[PDB]
């Protein structure tokens, strides 16, 4: 619906904040080989 395709949009902005998870946590592993 309206408030549906506005579910979809805000729960993609869920996905991207998922990628931004994975990326911040291959970082705080690069803060790992920088321990040494």
């Amino acid at each position: 619906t309206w408030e549906x395709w506005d579910x979809a949009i805000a729960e993609y902005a869920x996905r991207i904040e998922x990628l931004i998870x994975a990326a911040q946590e291959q970082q705080e592993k690069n803060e790992x080989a920088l321990x040494e």
Binding site: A22, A23, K29
Partner: protein, 33 residues
């Protein structure tokens, strides 16, 4: 490396933000009704 796997994660995020921009440029260019 595996850092180069996070590069694809940074790339993947930039890429998806881009689609949220268009979706939102759509909302506006429509909300001019």
């Amino acid at each position: 490396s595996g850092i180069v796997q996070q590069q694809n994660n940074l790339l993947r995020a930039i890429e998806a933000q881009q689609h949220l921009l268009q979706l939102t440029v759509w909302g506006i260019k429509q909300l001019q009704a």
